[PDB]
């Protein structure tokens, strides 16, 4: 049931912190920085709660928004 | 728009899952806004400007969906796939 979600996050230093917050969440297997602006977190996992992640990233880092959801093709 | 002139997306192929076969490039009024990866013969949901779009990929990474006016997302097969 694996999922790829991408979350755009305002990360102008803090990227460290955002990545730490995501890689610790339940279900998350990996997080890496992607995108032309190096501001999209590409999050891979099983049972990942996007809403929760977006919410925490807003609280702790700055603006966050979910921009891509793709089921992992096996 | 010639995708042969577009620099690769800033991708990260996670080693724990299959490598996606497509590059996608998003444009507003023909100017590139962002780019990434997606699977061929598949589907994704993507935020395209103000709207969520359900984007289908074919076996050659041709992408289809209901894009908002001004916006497009174009696909191409990655080298060697």
Structure tokens at B45: 């949901």
Q: What is the tally of structural domains in chain A? A: 1
Which residue, among A45, A63, A44, A42, has the nearest Cα to A54 in the 3D structure? A63
Q: Which residue of A has its CA nearest to B52?
A: A67
Whether A26 contacts A49, CB under 8 Å: yes
Structure tokens at A25: 């969440």
Q: Which residue of A has its CA nearest to B46?
A: A68
Whether B71 contacts B26, CB under 8 Å: yes
Expressed as residue numbers, the domain containing A68 is: 1-74
Three-class DSSP category at A37:
coil
Judged on CB neighbours under 10 Å (0-12, 13-18, 19+), B36 is buried
A35 → closest Cβ in B14, B36, B44? B36
Question: Which residues of chain B neighbour A38 with C-beta distances below 8 Å?
Answer: 10
List of residues 6+ apart from B63 with CB closer than 8 A: B22, B24, B38, B55, B56, B57, B73, B74, B75
Beta bridge partners of A61: none
Degrees, nearest 5: CA angle A68-B54-A56: 30
Give resolution in angstroms: 1.9
Per the CB < 8 Å rule, is B46 touching A68?
yes
Q: Identify the H or E element spanning A21.
A: helix A15-24
Whether B74 contacts B60, CB under 8 Å: no
Please write down the HEC assignment for all residues of chain B: CCHHHCCCCCCCCCCCCCCCCEEEEEEECCEEEEEEEECCCEEEEEEECCEEEEEEECCCCCEECCCCCCEEEEEEECCCC
Name the CA dihedral angle for B11, B15, B21, B24, rounded to a multiple of 10 degrees: -20
Structure tokens at A15: 């990227």
Residue that is written with structure tokens 């696909």 in the block? B75
The experimental method is: X-ray
Which residue, among A35, A62, A31, has the nearest Cα to A48 in the 3D structure? A31
CA distance A6 to A23: 13
């Amino acid at each position: 049931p694996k999922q790829k979600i991408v979350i755009k996050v305002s990360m102008p230093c803090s990227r460290s912190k955002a990545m730490k917050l995501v890689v610790m969440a339940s279900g998350v297997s990996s997080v890496e920085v992607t995108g032309d602006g190096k501001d999209r977190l590409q999050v891979v996992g099983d049972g990942v709660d996007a809403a929760c992640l977006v919410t925490c990233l807003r609280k702790k880092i700055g603006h966050a928004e979910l921009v891509q959801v793709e089921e992992v093709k096996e | 728009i010639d995708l042969s002139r577009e620099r690769d997306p800033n991708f990260f192929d996670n080693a724990d899952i299959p490598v996606p076969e497509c590059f996608w490039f998003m444009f507003k009024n023909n100017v590139r806004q962002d780019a990434g990866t997606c699977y061929s013969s598949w589907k994704m949901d993507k935020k395209v400007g103000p709207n969520w779009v359900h984007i289908k990929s074919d076996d050659n990474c041709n992408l289809s969906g209901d894009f908002p006016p001004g916006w497009i997302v174009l696909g191409k097969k990655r080298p060697g796939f």
